[model samples]
Target: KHSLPDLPYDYGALEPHINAQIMQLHHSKHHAAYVNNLNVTEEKYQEALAKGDVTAQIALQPALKFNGGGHINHSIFWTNLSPNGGGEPKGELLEAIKRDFGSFDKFKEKLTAASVGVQGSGWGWLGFNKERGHLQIAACPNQDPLQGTTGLIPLLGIDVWEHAYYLQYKNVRPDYLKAIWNVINWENVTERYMACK
Candidate 1:
């Protein structure tokens, strides 16, 4: 069964970048619902499998992907932020970014552009393309996880869903995007990238 994970820092930790109310609702309400529903959907899928009900199993795919992806995506999202994060990454991760994207600032611009360009609820990700052996920025719709949908290992994720920034940034997603840079956990992202090597 899927379960909700606790935030590493308090809801208010992100401060002016992301407000307490948004974090609280995003975690306790939205992410929790995904966990609960994923568990329920998995249980039903097991029943369908045991009974050899192909139609029922097929019918459950969307829910499985949505909730399962929601759980996976948010798990990474929380860890990707820190009360003491932001500022450029260092070491091999930074070197890799420079090598792949020309420069750190350019990489940020590309990632920000990918994030802001999403027409609706989605996530923008910095992911490692295992096949290409380099970094790539990609966007996914709704609750789709980066790896599952795009075959790239997710290093960092930017949640552009309205629920993630609406309370604090109102209708201006770019403002929220710009502010989020202050709390980005480069350490966590570095670890994730290192693991893939």
Candidate 2:
């Protein structure tokens, strides 16, 4: 069965930028729901498969996609942040940033814009294009998996879900986007990029 993953740090670890309250609820409540629902959906899908119920299998697709993507996305999202994070990436990741987006600041601005520009519940992603051997920025709506949907290897992700920041940032999604940079785990992002690239 799927289960909630433990945070790398305490709930208060990302305080000020993310705040403990949000982390507490986001991890315990929201992400927990996703994990729980994913397990339930997987079991249902398994039952359908065993019964040869093609119609039931087809109906379960959206639930599997949504909850499974939620599990995948949130798993990576937690690692993408750290209390000691922020600053900038180095080495090959930095080199790719310069080559792909001109400069680090420019890349940051573009990513921020993408996160802010998300119309509703979604995510902003910095992904690797294995085919083109470069970096790319994109947004996905409603728990869509970046790799599954776009064939891009997700290196970093910023959740634009209302539950992610509504309690703290209120209606100002841009402020949440801006504040999140203070805790971006470039080390994790670099590792993901290096593994994929």
Candidate 3:
């Protein structure tokens, strides 16, 4: 069953950067709706497949895939940020970003550019390529998971969905992108990197 995960901090904790109203609605309402819809869609898909109803089975695929992916992606997105987060990466995560992307500033620049450049609703990702043992930046349209679609293990994700920032930053996504850096949990990213290695 899908459920809302406890936020790492209170809705207002990330204020000034991300407004409380935005966080509250985005997490409690928007994300919750995705989780609920995902669970329902998945159940219907399972039932259709079990009943060998090919038409129903086919019809359920898009909703199941989209909402399921939204739930998974937002679950990670919540954990990927914290009021206590931001500053610079430390230890191996810092070292690797420096090695691969030149410097911490450059990494931020690349990621910010990617996030702002997204044509519409999507996500910007900093992913670790396990096979190549390197880091890369990529974007996924709609609710697609970074690793599942591109074979790049998600290290960090910036959700460019308007629900993520519209209330605070309006349509100026770059402003939101810049502000979001203030709450990027590099520690969580470090753990993901170590697990992948």
**How do the residues 82-107 of candidate 3 rate in per-residue lDDT, one tens digit apiece?**
88888998999999999999999999
Of candidate 1, the 10-residue stretch with the lowest lDDT total is 1-10
Q: Count the backbone clashes (under 3 Å) in each candidate.
A: 0, 0, 0
In candidate 3, list every pair of residues with a backbone clash. none
Candidate 3 residue 125 C-alpha distance from true site, Å: 0.3
lDDT for 50 in candidate 2 is: 99
Write candidate 1's Cα lDDT for 41-154 as tens digits: 999999999999999999999999999999999999999999999999999999999999999999999999999999989999999999989999999999999999889999
lDDT of 2 by residue, 97-179 (tens): 99999999999999999989899799999999999888999999999999999999999999999999999999998899889
Better of 1 and 3 by lDDT: 1
TM-score of 1: 0.98
Q: Sort by lDDT, best first.
A: 1, 2, 3
Q: Where is model 1 more than 4 Å wrong at Cα?
A: none
Candidate 2 residues lying further than 4 Å off, grouped into runs, are none
* Most TM-score-accurate candidate: 1
Candidate 1 lDDT score at position 136 = 94
Q: Among all windows of ten consecutive residues in candidate 3, which has the lowest summed lDDT?
A: 60-69
